[PDB]
Amino acid sequence: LNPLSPDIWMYVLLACLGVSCVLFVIARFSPYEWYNPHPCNPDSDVVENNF
């Protein structure tokens, strides 16, 4: 791992953590990520999550 100074490793790790977390948070505010699993039977509009 020598070429990259340990600084960038920790910054990239924190950036990955933050982007994944904010993506998950947006999933809560995502309108369409709810997808009532197995929509072959949309008879039941079971509001179910994703992401």
Binding site: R28, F29, V47, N49
Partner: peptide, 9 residues
């Protein structure tokens, strides 16, 4: 109400 719906889960 929608905020509560999608937060309380």
């Amino acid at each position: 109400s929608a905020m509560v719906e999608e937060l309380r889960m």
